[PDB]
Amino acid sequence: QFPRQCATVEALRSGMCCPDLSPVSGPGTDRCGSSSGRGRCEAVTADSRPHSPQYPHDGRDDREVWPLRFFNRTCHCNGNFSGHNCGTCRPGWRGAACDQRVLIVRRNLLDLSKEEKNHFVRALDMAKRTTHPLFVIATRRSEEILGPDGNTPQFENISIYNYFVWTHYYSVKKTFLGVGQESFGEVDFSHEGPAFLTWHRYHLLRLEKDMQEMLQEPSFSLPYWNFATGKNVCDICTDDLMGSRSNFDSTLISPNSVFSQWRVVCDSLEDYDTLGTLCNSTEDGPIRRNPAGNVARPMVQRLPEPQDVAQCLEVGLFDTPPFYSNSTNSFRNTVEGYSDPTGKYDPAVRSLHNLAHLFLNGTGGQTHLSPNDPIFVLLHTFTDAVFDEWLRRYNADISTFPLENAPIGHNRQYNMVPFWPPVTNTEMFVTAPDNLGYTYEIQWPS
Ligand SMILES: N[C@@H](Cc1ccc(O)cc1)C(=O)O
Ligand SMILES: [Zn+2]
Numbered sequence: 541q542f543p544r545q546c547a548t549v550e551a552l553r554s555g556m557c558c559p560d561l562s563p564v565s566g567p568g569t570d571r572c573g574s575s576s577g578r579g580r581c582e583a584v585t586a587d588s589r590p591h592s593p594q595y596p597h598d599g600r601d602d603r604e605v606w607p608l609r610f611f612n613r614t615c616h617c618n619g620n621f622s623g624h625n626c627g628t629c630r631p632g633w634r635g636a637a638c639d640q641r642v643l644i645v646r647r648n649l650l651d652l653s654k655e656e657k658n659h660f661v662r663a664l665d666m667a668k669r670t671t672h673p674l675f676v677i678a679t680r681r682s683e684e685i686l687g688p689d690g691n692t693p694q695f696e697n698i699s700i701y702n703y704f705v706w707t708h709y710y711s712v713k714k715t716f717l718g719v720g721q722e723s724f725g726e727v728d729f730s731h732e733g734p735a736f737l738t739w740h741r742y743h744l745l746r747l748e749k750d751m752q753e754m755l756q757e758p759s760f761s762l763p764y765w766n767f768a769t770g771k772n773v774c775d776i777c778t779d780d781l782m783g784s785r786s787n788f789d790s791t792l793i794s795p796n797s798v799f800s801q802w803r804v805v806c807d808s809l810e811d812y813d814t815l816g817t818l819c820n821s822t823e824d825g826p827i828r829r830n831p832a833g834n835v836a837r838p839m840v841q842r843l844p845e846p847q848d849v850a851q852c853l854e855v856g857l858f859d860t861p862p863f864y865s866n867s868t869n870s871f872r873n874t875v876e877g878y879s880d881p882t883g884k885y886d887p888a889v890r891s892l893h894n895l896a897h898l899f900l901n902g903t904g905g906q907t908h909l910s911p912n913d914p915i916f917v918l919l920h921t922f923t924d925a926v927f928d929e930w931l932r933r934y935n936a937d938i939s940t941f942p943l944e945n946a947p948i949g950h951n952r953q954y955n956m957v958p959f960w961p962p963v964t965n966t967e968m969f970v971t972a973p974d975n976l977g978y979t980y981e982i983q984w985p986s
């Protein structure tokens with residue numbers, strides 16, 4: 541979503557989100573940091589190629605051809621500068637001139653020290669409470685974007701972690717057709733499609749950078765959760781980590797974990813699809829979690845098994861047609877978890893990433909809401925680690941990633957929704973240690 545600078549009336553009608561960085565001579569003088577060498581305001585590149593027929597309603601949704609329904613001018617930064625301003629560096633780079641290489645290691649959460657574990661938890665909690673310095677979030681769609689009196693832009697501040705929750709939600713939201721109409725649900729800009737891995741890759745990358753600056757610890761790194769242990773229990777659901785089960789309510793978090801204080805955003809789906817609003821920054825109920833607790837669906841009461849991971853890393857093609865949740869022999873669908881680990885589709889199966897989510901039987905198992913459970917972060921860094929080792933192993937072969945006729949949002953050169961500045965699936969489809977400034981301290985079953 542957009543920087544405060546662009547959540548204006550002036551920017552929203554220029555269609556230009558190109559804020560100043562060091563406005564030496566006054567407003568408009570140093571857009572994208574062109575006083576220094578750092579970048580320029582420029583036309584926006586966005587994918588025009590067609591998408592799967594599954595989504596009929598082109599013309600209705602503001603996530604189509606993202607981000608062109610809100611802005612047609614963006615900053616493009618030079619070299620290894622990056623950021624809405626070109627005010628910072630590309631991932632893996634720091635310094636005033638973005639020429640000092642940095643490499644951070646995402647470790648297994650259970651291998652961290654007592655003080656590392658505790659630093660992580662309170663960082664999360666701090667990110668849940670601290671206002672995001674950059675981004676605000678839209679409470680209404682583009683029609684009512686400038687509010688009732690056409691001169692009050694409908695954006696709210698929001699905490700760092702809730703932004704993480706909100707962007708995921710905005711990408712899964714249903715298409716509003718009109719009051720009295722039934723909203724459209726066969727659309728997911730981040731799941732059931734080849735953008736699933738790269739969307740969630742950047743998602744994590746933006747939370748990590750935000751926490752790096754909130755803590756001002758450039759080396760801060762997001763640990764991972766090896767959820768592929770075949771276990772009957774959540775081995776990170778302890779009070780020093782992500783919170784044990786409440787003894788007063790089997791679906792709540794132990795009051796001795798700070799996460800029992802957290803209150804969720806984006807739970808009022810009935811309001812969003814009825815009135816046409818969007819998730820705002822007003823928190824509601826608490827997190828709901830009950831590992832293994834879904835007695836109604838026994839498939840989901842046990843986590844994936846270590847081989848499940850070893851089998852999916854042998855699926856050689858990244859994705860296969862129709863590039864959807866029912867593709868066979870697609871690595872992206874296998875580790876997403878709509879096929880079994882060998883690649884074989886079945887509408888009943890749930891493996892790997894999906895089954896980790898379902899196992900929680902709670903807030904973490906509902907797509908519009910699962911980031912509210914901070915196990916999400918650990919759940920997707922591990923999903924990303926598997927992605928990263930597939931990229932190492934098959935030499936980042938993006939040939940199977942379709943350029944056309946993926947479900948809308950999942951074409952290879954689609955700008956991933958709603959990240960800003962616009963960033964494509966291709967930009968994330970690279971091995972992370974050499975290109976994105978991070979690596980995984982991890983070993984793989986064989
Ligand atoms: N909804 C998925 C699982 C899932 C849940 C929440 C998510 O955020 C993502 C995936 C399923 O049908 O198995
Ligand atoms: Zn350019």
Ligand SMILES: [Zn+2]
Nearest residue numbers: 708730731740
């Ligand atoms: Zn997701």
Ligand SMILES: [Zn+2]
Nearest residue numbers: 893897910920
């Ligand atoms: Zn997920």
